[PDB]
Design a protein around this ligand. Structure first.
Ligand SMILES: N[C@@H](CCC(=O)N[C@@H](CS)C(=O)NCC(=O)O)C(=O)O
Ligand SMILES: N[C@@H](CCC(=O)N[C@@H](CS)C(=O)NCC(=O)O)C(=O)O
Lengths: 206, 205
């Protein structure tokens, strides 16, 4: 039976659970810690040498890693992933934008401020995050002011990939009211059948 | 005719030029500055709101961005990219690992040290790059010690994506002799027909 190794509250892990649920796959969740008892354990590194969650393990033992690769793997042949061509390429562009220009600022600031509550250890990092995260939101705003979805005329895994952390941007100290087209898109994605939100970290973390 | 907006010496821009030449596409290179005269100019931001090179613009006006998306776009239907399935997923995994775990350390160290020659101004960051870049090479080494290519039995865009900066790792002060499987793989990729190396940055300056 299929397993997701993940951390409760993680947007990257949410991507994996969300696409599995959207595409009709049953799975077992395995709560995995950070460090020698989890992501840096012998057993885990045997699944993923990179030492990161999410990892999805198929009933045949195959271990899949990288949240955006997991989105691509399970969305293949569904309306969540266009076929090769311009639309698929536009999806790819947003997924690499997400990993390079968005996640490292939004997800990280949320982690440091609302998960660890270590704002004080990362003043420099956090100011940079605030600036570069705002720039990533500006890119999303510019696009979503003119089209309601990231690609083509309907939702795709590009929307899922950027929704993962953007829907919880308040925990990274971003006020989405200042990016009204992004806010409207967050609401549009949240209203889609089958989409679930990450509850507030304060309510799910020990 | 097709254009590539890029920076000479850039590994990410090399990915675009390299896949276009491997797949038989002629292109015009357009050198693009960093900042108001290039990547942050109004004309360039109209092509790519992210304000980053490479950008590939087709004759019909279509502007493509993100070096790994550009690899995916032009490799589709060629031996460089398998059709959907497990091997194709393995390719994706390496492309995301490259962007998240490898490029931000190896490409950035190379740029700050060997392009800008400002190592003295980025101490904490470059120490972090040295540590995390080494970890990324360890992942590559563990794989490549057991097989010659990143995915399956032959070269794919996974190899191209990782080769782009790894082949010039010496400019970020990584000695590839210390990762012998990665060293062997760099030579293996470099020997494929039509693969061109990025010239040393000291020849470009
Ligand atoms: N590029 C990866 C990044 C995943 C990632 O950063 N995972 C984190 C949690 S959100 C992790 O496993 N932390 C590393 C550790 O604890 O060692 C992806 O999108 O899957
Ligand atoms: N994820 C991008 C990264 C590209 C990138 O970092 N390009 C830099 C090269 S210096 C850039 O254009 N930055 C210019 C700017 O931000 O103004 C890709 O792979 O294409």
């Amino acid at each position: 039976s299929m397993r997701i190794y993940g951390m409760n509250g993680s947007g990257n892990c949410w991507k994996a659970a969300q696409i599995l649920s959207l595409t009709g796959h049953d799975f077992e969740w395995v709560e995995t810690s950070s460090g020698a008892a989890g992501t840096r354990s012998a057993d885990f590194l045997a699944l993923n040498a990179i030492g990161k969650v999410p990892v999805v393990v198929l009933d045949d033992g195959t271990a899949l890693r990288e949240s955006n690769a997991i989105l691509l793997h399970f969305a293949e042949g569904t309306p969540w992933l266009p076929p090769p061509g311009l639309a698929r390429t536009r999806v790819h562009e947003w997924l690499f934008f997400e990993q390079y220009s968005h996640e490292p600022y939004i997800a990280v600031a949320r982690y440091l401020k609302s998960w660890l509550r270590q704002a004080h250890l990362h003043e420099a990092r956090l100011a940079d995050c605030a600036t570069r995260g705002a720039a990533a939101l500006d890119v999303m705003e510019q696009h979503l002011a003119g089209e309601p979805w990231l690609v083509g005329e309907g939702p795709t895994i590009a929307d899922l990939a950027l929704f993962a952390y953007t829907h919880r941007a308040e925990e990274a100290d971003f006020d989405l009211a200042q990016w009204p087209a992004v806010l409207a898109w967050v609401d549009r994605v949240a209203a889609l059948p089958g989409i679930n939100l990450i509850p507030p970290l304060d309510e799910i973390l020990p």
